[PDB]
């Protein structure tokens, strides 16, 4: 078959590579903007997250392979530099394409990169302080960390209840964050908005007025299998089939109903006290409204619909037993909830699961009338948390803003590596691919790239001051001032899938077809 | 170019591949054109005429390329051409087949100056060996078979099969007649084809053959003051009348008579001017004629301008029309001055011959120009290949032999080279057996019998192919132990003047 | 028909490589050289960058315009020319990559200059103030002709060259337009460059054997008339008057036996013997009976001479001119201590050599009298002028890219501004320079980053001018090997990349009209 050969087998490869790459040039910082998408799904995913639109919908490449590899992990490792690791290879590429457009080594070229990457991982481990956990501290980091990754009113609208979510953690262990993630989704009135909410919250509640409102002292009944059935484990089943069938089956439900209530009313009354403490069953199907007014007399609370994923974080925030019936049960099987709270925003019933025993999670409730609003705000949350935990999961950080960037390019000294030039010409390519950073900053605002990031070099090449584009205006600043930092994760790993993916292109010397 | 730009037929593809094959196709022309062969290559004239020649020069004068690369080079052959006999249809194949080794050495892909100069470094090298390669020299240039062993060469080296009487009767043609010791001539030597007899017939008649007719009674004198005219009678009447012929009737009687004593005058004023021979390149008048009979002045009723040529070379002469009574200008030089019948054709003759202005005129009989022009081919170069003007040639091995000696010796000097400049010194050695593979054609074999042979012979300076049944099996004849040998002069040339283009017109990527 | 801006820089810089890449070896040995049968649709055969443009017939407006401020160069040194092509589309490349990216077609232009400047003070930093020896100048002699020939042919050159201009340092003239005289002559090999301090003379006399080895040399170059003719002539010349072509038939040869006497009584005079010899050149016919007359005498008595030549042999021997020969002091006519009257083919070319106060020395060449003996000839003469800039500068600085890198150094090494803004000019700027060696070195050899990183770390370590080794890829101390840019040549080249590159920057539109 079809054999690609040589810098034929090169071109469509760094073709298709740096071209699609320039493509996304558009993002990057606040500076940058959303990138449009529109998935198979028709939806409107109008984003700066550079892991999103790589996986979603891609011009096909062979290219769009490895690609989707690299910033695959760039997401998973840090949740940010995926918007980063797209405009480092080309930049690398086009001017390492260069030598090999002069016809030198994608071999050679390859192991200048490879050299050059550990004084700048030298120099991010050099540039690097340790950023403290304290919010603030991480404040500016998430209010940095969503700029690259999102708009900043986008980026600044979380940092608050951001850093929130990484405050509340137990001394986890994650660069990300897994339980701090409760997503509630809401149609709303403002389109960015998100409330955070401490701990677990149930998707729906059950609301009744006897039912009590917050429930500081709450035996936790997780339940299951509903009132359908008459004290089963297992779910039974339904003849709806024949009209007739239809008619005699939902009667008898009332004493399956009736079982569970019961059941449920007086494993109240052993735990409770009659009335006398509050109680919860969260009843993870629908209530049905004889137990929903019968367990409400009783001062249990019932709770529609928890989630089995509710269910998890459920019994772990009251430190408590899940239970999949209704029923009479050992009393250390109920979770005791220092708070069950249920809220009622607009239709849903956000059941508040408080002063959990495991402040494991905590709940940002997603807001927007709008889908890609609702989509997209969401999508801002889920990668920063990700980002912005490494600045709480590192005491280490290091500088955004492309304050570090134009220093090791300064530092880099090319002719240092005087072996060849397969090290001194690929730390050329280097230096380039570093300043990517300022130059789309610089780039997306007036000027230049250059014209900005030329005082940038010429700014700190009056070395110890540490300049890059100011985020927004494309024109100098000084990322250590104001704290505007990227994750010791984000600029640390950044560099590793870089570096690989643009050399994997220069260890494809054939494409068969 | 990529532009509208500037001037180029070559480059890129042309430079590399194109000029290599415009280096190639005519060189693969001479392959059989040089060397012992049956070869045989047809030609037509701008006069259209059918003929056929193992010589370049001829084809290669009708021959036009967009190229230089087929172009420029031939000039070099000619450049031999211009010492020496053939050995010039040896030039440009040895060129051209060392050239194309280095458009693989451009597949590798070495530069021209690395290309370059091993060649050149292993041109010495050749040059070096190629006195070693001495293995006789020319004893008497005034024996015959002392120069026959050569003659045969050049003519062999033209074709194969009537070699020898040919470098028999050439130096039978007496090239003995000069010293050729620094004073040889070709002028007082030449080759004049008598349309007659046979070519085994054809002889030498030293002193001036001219197969032109002698005209009326023979020289005045042998040592003939030379009358040598474009026109020395045009007619001296004009007939322009009433009529053009009579209207006053008389007046046509006085000029038909009184122009031929005019032609009287002009004819007794060359008996007056003194020539004791007058040359009409154009007409004979026939009253001047049987005045210039009754005045016992030899004439040539018509005179090629070629004949006034070498009449007016080497008489000293100068062909002019002349309206007047003649003046001598030309006056003489040859001090025997005859009339000869060879292939029993009037042959107008001038012999002075001192060893000096010794003119020994080789006269072709034949019936047929175009078997004696192929002819004349060889022989025009075998009296060259002879004409050295070293009365010591050097004799080398003739017919090729010497190619293997330095095959082996400077490739395996070659081999010790080092770098890239190797392949150009090892390439170099590597450009003999193209003959040894273009003859070895015509003789029948493939040239790795022969190569292997001819290496397998190793050093000879004898062991050597052609067109023959030695040439096929053997990869073995006698190129030096047979008679047939070479002056080491045009090898020097050979080698030298074909090496310089090689690397000299890749260079050139315009 | 128009091309915008980018569209227009385009057709500019695009031109520039291909036509720019055929120079890559122009320049020191390793220049290979190229064959017009096409420039006006004849064989030929050239090196040098500004002859090459105007012998092609060159249709591109950048093939064009360059020519004509190249042939600044080449009129200047007539050599790097040879050269400067190679930097200027280089730097056509470096500007377009800002703009590539973007930027201010100004401002790269704009950013130029102080770098044009800062290296051209790096000129004066670098430039190698040298003492000329005729060997200094025999290996700037060979640096020009290893540009044009083979090093062997620059030898034979390299020769009559130093010698050449050698007469002309005692002249103290800087330039030369004299001893610049050259012959070619019929010859098998082109190889034959011969060195006469005097003339040489064309024309030979029509008649031989009258003094065919003219020891001394008295020569009054003469216009004069000895033909004025001998039989009927009127003025000199047939006429309608019978009348007057009737008295004017004697006078002829009595007004030239006249100017033969005035020869005669000016030989006897001019020598009283045959023994020293003794020289007449008419700039018209002479009779040969005069000549008869004259050539018995000891005379070699010369006609139809070249009014030029005239000057050669009124200047470099001193000789002098009249109307008519009358008598003049021995002296009073110009000398060459010997005259050689030589024939190599047919015709006797007269050396009147050692001409008294040469202010012009002959250089013959023998050769096969083809493009071939042109290519030669031409080789040499600007290589003259490059040697002849060796006069004019005290400094004279090695070539084979010994200077690029450690002047592309600075400027790179440091922003010689500071500034982005001039560095865009400046690394765009800066940049080109290295093109000569970098090719060179690769031409003849391996890539240019190892010859750059070691020219530079060994200028870097050095600081000592190391240069190519131009057929090897190696480089050499280039000052030692003999490679030599004249601080006259590659200043010169430098203004001149950077003064055309910058307006040709500049055309934003061409429209075809006129």
Same mark, same amino acid.
């Given at each position: 078959?079809?054999?690609? #050969?040589?810098?034929?087998?090169?071109?469509?490869?760094?073709?298709?590579?740096?071209?699609?790459?320039?493509?996304?040039?558009?993002?990057? +910082?606040?500076?940058?903007?959303?990138?449009?998408?529109?998935?198979?799904? +028709?939806?409107?995913?109008?984003?700066?997250?550079?892991?999103?639109?790589?996986?979603?919908?891609?011009?096909?490449?062979?290219?769009? /392979?490895?690609?989707?590899?690299?910033?695959?992990?760039?997401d998973?490792?840090?949740?940010?530099?995926?918007?980063?690791?797209?405009?480092?290879?080309?930049?690398?590429?086009?001017?390492?394409?260069?030598?090999?457009?002069?016809?030198?080594?994608?071999?050679?070229?390859?192991?200048?990169?490879?050299?050059?990457?550990?004084?700048?991982?030298?120099f991010?481990?050099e540039?690097?302080?340790?950023?403290?956990?304290? #919010?603030?501290?991480?404040?500016?980091?998430?209010?940095?960390?969503?700029?690259?990754?999102?708009?900043?009113?986008?980026?600044?609208?979380?940092?608050?209840?951001?850093?929130?979510?990484?405050?509340?953690?137990?001394?986890?262990?994650? *660069? !990300?964050?897994?339980?701090?993630?409760?997503?509630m989704?809401?149609?709303? %009135?403002?389109?960015?908005?998100?409330?955070?909410?401490?701990?677990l919250?149930?998707?729906?509640?059950? #609301?009744?007025? @006897?039912?009590?409102?917050?429930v500081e002292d709450?035996?936790?009944?997780?339940?299951?299998? /509903?009132?359908?059935?008459?004290?089963?484990?297992?779910?039974?089943?339904?003849?709806?089939?024949?009209?007739?069938?239809?008619?005699?089956?939902?009667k008898?439900?009332?004493?399956?109903?009736?079982?569970?209530?019961? %059941?449920?009313?007086?494993?109240? #009354?052993?735990?409770?006290? @009659?009335?006398?403490?509050?109680?919860?069953?969260?009843?993870?199907?629908?209530?049905?409204?004889?137990?929903?007014?019968?367990?409400?007399?009783?001062? !249990?609370?019932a709770?529609?619909?928890?989630?089995?994923?509710?269910?998890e974080?459920?019994?772990?925030?009251?430190?408590?037993?899940?239970?999949?019936?209704?029923?009479?049960? /050992?009393?250390?099987?109920?979770?005791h909830?220092?708070?069950?709270?249920?809220?009622?925003?607009?239709?849903?019933?956000?059941?508040?699961?408080?002063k959990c025993?495991?402040?494991?999670?905590?709940?940002?409730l997603?807001?927007? *009338?709008?889908?890609?609003?609702?989509?997209?705000?969401?999508?801002?949350?889920?990668?920063?948390?990700?980002?912005?935990?490494?600045?709480?999961?590192?005491?280490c950080?290091?500088? +955004?803003?492309?304050?570090?960037?134009?220093?090791?390019?300064?530092?880099?000294?090319?002719?240092? *590596?005087?072996?060849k030039?397969?090290?001194?010409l690929?730390?050329?390519?280097?230096?380039?691919?570093?300043?990517?950073?300022?130059?789309?900053?610089?780039?997306?605002?007036?000027?230049?790239?250059?014209? =900005?990031?030329?005082?940038?070099?010429?700014?700190?090449?009056?070395?110890?001051?540490?300049?890059?584009?100011?985020?927004?205006?494309?024109? *100098?600043?000084?990322?250590?001032?104001?704290?505007?930092?990227?994750?010791?994760?984000?600029?640390?790993?950044?560099?590793?899938?870089?570096?690989?993916?643009? =050399?994997?292109?220069?260890?494809?010397?054939?494409?068969?077809? | 170019?990529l532009?509208?730009?500037?001037?180029?037929?070559?480059?890129?593809?042309?430079?590399?591949?194109?000029?290599?094959?415009?280096?190639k196709?005519?060189?693969? &022309?001479?392959?059989?054109?040089?060397?012992?062969?049956?070869?045989?290559?047809?030609?037509?004239?701008?006069?259209?005429?059918?003929?056929?020649?193992?010589?370049?020069?001829?084809?290669?004068?009708?021959?036009?390329?967009?190229?230089?690369?087929?172009?420029?080079?031939?000039?070099?052959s000619?450049?031999?051409?211009?010492?020496?006999?053939?050995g010039?249809?040896?030039?440009?194949?040895?060129?051209?087949?060392?050239?194309?080794?280095?458009?693989?050495?451009?597949?590798?892909?070495?530069?021209?100056?690395?290309?370059?100069?091993g060649?050149?470094?292993?041109?010495?090298?050749?040059?070096?060996?190629?006195?070693?390669?001495?293995?006789?020299?020319?004893?008497?240039?005034?024996?015959?078979?002392?120069?026959?062993?050569?003659?045969?060469?050049?003519?062999?080296?033209?074709?194969?099969?009537?070699?020898?009487?040919?470098?028999?009767?050439?130096?039978?043609?007496?090239?003995?007649?000069?010293?050729?010791?620094?004073?040889?001539?070709?002028?007082?030597?030449?080759?004049?084809?008598?349309?007659?007899?046979?070519?085994?017939?054809?002889?030498?008649?030293?002193?001036?053959?001219?197969?032109?007719?002698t005209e009326?009674?023979?020289?005045?004198?042998?040592?003939?003051?030379?009358?040598?005219?474009?026109?020395?009678?045009?007619?001296?009447?004009?007939?322009?009348?009433?009529?053009?012929?009579?209207?006053?009737?008389?007046?046509?009687?006085?000029?038909?008579?009184?122009?031929?004593?005019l032609?009287?005058?002009?004819?007794?004023?060359?008996?007056?001017?003194?020539?004791?021979?007058? $040359?009409?390149?154009?007409?004979?008048?026939?009253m001047?004629?049987?005045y210039?009979?009754?005045?016992?002045?030899?004439?040539?009723?018509?005179?090629?301008?070629?004949?006034?040529?070498?009449?007016?070379? &080497?008489?000293?002469?100068?062909?002019?029309?002349?309206?007047?009574?003649? $003046?001598?200008?030309?006056?003489?030089?040859?001090?025997? $001055?005859?009339?000869?019948?060879?292939?029993?054709?009037?042959?107008?003759?001038?012999?002075?011959?001192?060893?000096?202005?010794?003119?020994? &005129?080789?006269?072709?009989?034949?019936?047929?120009?175009?078997?004696?022009?192929?002819?004349?081919?060889?022989?025009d170069?075998?009296?060259?290949?002879?004409?050295?003007?070293?009365?010591?040639?050097?004799?080398?091995?003739?017919?090729?032999?010497?190619?293997?000696?330095?095959?082996k010796?400077?490739?395996?000097?070659?081999?010790?080279?080092?770098?890239?400049?190797?392949?150009?010194?090892?390439?170099f050695?590597?450009?003999?057996?193209?003959?040894?593979?273009?003859?070895?054609?015509?003789?029948?074999?493939?040239?790795?019998?022969?190569?292997?042979?001819?290496?397998?012979?190793?050093?000879?300076?004898?062991?050597?192919?052609?067109?023959?049944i030695?040439?096929?099996?053997?990869? $073995?004849?006698?190129?030096?132990?047979?008679?047939?040998?070479?002056?080491?002069?045009?090898?020097?040339?050979?080698?030298?003047?074909?090496?310089?283009?090689?690397?000299?017109?890749?260079?050139?990527?315009?």
């Amino acid at each position: 078959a079809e054999v690609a #050969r040589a810098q034929a087998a090169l071109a469509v490869n760094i073709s298709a590579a740096r071209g699609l790459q320039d493509v996304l040039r558009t993002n990057l +910082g606040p500076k940058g903007t959303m990138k449009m998408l529109v998935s198979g799904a +028709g939806d409107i995913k109008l984003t700066k997250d550079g892991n999103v639109l790589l996986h979603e919908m891609q011009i096909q490449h062979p290219t769009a /392979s490895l690609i989707a590899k690299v910033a695959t992990a760039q997401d998973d490792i840090t949740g940010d530099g995926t918007t980063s690791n797209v405009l480092i290879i080309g930049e690398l590429l086009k001017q390492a394409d260069l030598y090999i457009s002069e016809g030198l080594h994608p071999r050679i070229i390859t192991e200048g990169f490879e050299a050059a990457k550990e004084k700048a991982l030298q120099f991010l481990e050099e540039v690097k302080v340790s950023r403290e956990m304290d #919010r603030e501290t991480l404040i500016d980091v998430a209010r940095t960390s969503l700029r690259t990754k999102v708009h900043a009113e986008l980026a600044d609208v979380l940092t608050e209840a951001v850093v929130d979510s990484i405050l509340a953690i137990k001394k986890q262990d994650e *660069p !990300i964050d897994l339980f701090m993630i409760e997503i509630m989704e809401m149609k709303h %009135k403002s389109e960015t908005d998100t409330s955070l909410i401490r701990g677990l919250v149930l998707d729906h509640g059950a #609301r009744h007025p @006897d039912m009590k409102k917050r429930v500081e002292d709450a035996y936790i009944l997780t339940c299951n299998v /509903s009132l359908e059935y008459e004290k089963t484990e297992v779910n039974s089943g339904f003849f709806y089939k024949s009209a007739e069938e239809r008619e005699k089956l939902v009667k008898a439900e009332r004493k399956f109903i009736e079982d569970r209530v019961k %059941k449920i009313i007086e494993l109240k #009354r052993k735990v409770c006290g @009659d009335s006398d403490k509050g109680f919860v069953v969260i009843n993870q199907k629908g209530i049905d409204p004889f137990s929903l007014d019968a367990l409400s007399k009783e001062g !249990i609370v019932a709770l529609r619909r928890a989630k089995r994923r509710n269910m998890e974080r459920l019994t772990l925030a009251c430190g408590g037993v899940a239970l999949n019936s209704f029923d009479d049960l /050992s009393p250390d099987c109920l979770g005791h909830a220092g708070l069950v709270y249920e809220y009622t925003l607009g239709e849903e019933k956000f059941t508040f699961i408080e002063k959990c025993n495991n402040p494991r999670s905590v709940t940002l409730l997603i807001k927007g *009338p709008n889908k890609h609003t609702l989509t997209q705000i969401k999508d801002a949350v889920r990668d920063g948390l990700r980002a912005v935990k490494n600045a709480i999961d590192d005491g280490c950080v290091v500088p +955004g803003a492309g304050a570090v960037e134009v220093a090791m390019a300064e530092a880099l000294i090319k002719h240092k *590596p005087s072996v060849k030039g397969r090290a001194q010409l690929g730390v050329q390519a280097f230096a380039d691919a570093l300043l990517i950073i300022p130059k789309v900053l610089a780039q997306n605002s007036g000027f230049d790239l250059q014209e =900005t990031l030329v005082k940038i070099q010429a700014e700190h090449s009056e070395s110890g001051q540490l300049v890059g584009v100011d985020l927004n205006t494309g024109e *100098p600043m000084v990322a250590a001032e104001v704290g505007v930092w990227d994750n010791y994760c984000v600029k640390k790993q950044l560099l590793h899938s870089c570096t690989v993916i643009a =050399t994997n292109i220069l260890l494809v010397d054939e494409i068969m077809r | 170019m990529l532009k509208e730009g500037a001037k180029h037929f070559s480059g890129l593809e042309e430079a590399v591949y194109r000029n290599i094959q415009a280096c190639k196709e005519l060189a693969q &022309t001479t392959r059989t054109a040089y060397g012992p062969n049956g070869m045989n290559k047809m030609v037509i004239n701008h006069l259209e005429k059918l003929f056929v020649t193992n010589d370049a020069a001829t084809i290669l004068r009708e021959l036009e390329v967009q190229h230089p690369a087929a172009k420029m080079i031939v000039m070099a052959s000619h450049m031999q051409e211009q010492e020496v006999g053939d050995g010039t249809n040896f030039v440009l194949v040895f060129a051209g087949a060392l050239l194309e080794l280095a458009e693989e050495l451009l597949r590798i892909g070495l530069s021209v100056s690395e290309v370059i100069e091993g060649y050149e470094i292993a041109c010495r090298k050749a040059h070096e060996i190629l006195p070693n390669l001495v293995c006789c020299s020319a004893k008497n240039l005034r024996d015959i078979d002392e120069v026959s062993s050569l003659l045969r060469t050049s003519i062999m080296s033209k074709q194969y099969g009537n070699e020898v009487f040919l470098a028999k009767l050439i130096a039978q043609a007496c090239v003995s007649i000069f010293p050729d010791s620094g004073h040889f001539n070709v002028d007082n030597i030449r080759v004049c084809k008598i349309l007659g007899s046979g070519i085994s017939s054809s002889s030498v008649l030293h002193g001036m053959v001219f197969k032109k007719e002698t005209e009326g009674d023979v020289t005045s004198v042998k040592d003939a003051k030379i009358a040598v005219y474009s026109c020395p009678f045009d007619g001296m009447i004009t007939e322009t009348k009433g009529t053009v012929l009579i209207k006053t009737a008389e007046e046509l009687m006085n000029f038909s008579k009184g122009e031929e004593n005019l032609m009287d005058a002009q004819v007794k004023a060359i008996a007056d001017t003194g020539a004791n021979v007058v $040359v009409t390149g154009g007409k004979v008048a026939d009253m001047a004629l049987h005045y210039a009979n009754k005045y016992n002045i030899m004439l040539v009723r018509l005179n090629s301008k070629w004949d006034l040529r070498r009449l007016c070379k &080497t008489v000293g002469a100068t062909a002019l029309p002349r309206l007047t009574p003649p $003046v001598l200008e030309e006056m003489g030089h040859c001090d025997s $001055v005859y009339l000869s019948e060879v292939g029993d054709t009037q042959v107008v003759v001038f012999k002075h011959e001192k060893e000096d202005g010794a003119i020994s &005129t080789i006269v072709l009989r034949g019936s047929t120009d175009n078997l004696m022009d192929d002819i004349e081919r060889a022989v025009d170069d075998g009296v060259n290949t002879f004409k050295v003007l070293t009365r010591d040639k050097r004799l080398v091995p003739g017919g090729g032999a010497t190619e293997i000696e330095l095959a082996k010796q400077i490739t395996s000097y070659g081999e010790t080279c080092p770098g890239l400049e190797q392949y150009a010194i090892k390439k170099f050695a590597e450009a003999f057996e193209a003959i040894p593979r273009a003859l070895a054609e015509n003789s029948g074999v493939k040239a790795n019998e022969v190569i292997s042979k001819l290496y397998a012979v190793h050093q000879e300076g004898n062991k050597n192919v052609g067109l023959d049944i030695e040439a096929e099996v053997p990869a $073995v004849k006698d190129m030096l132990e047979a008679g047939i040998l070479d002056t080491y002069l045009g090898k020097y040339w050979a080698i030298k003047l074909a090496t310089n283009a090689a690397v000299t017109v890749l260079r050139v990527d315009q």
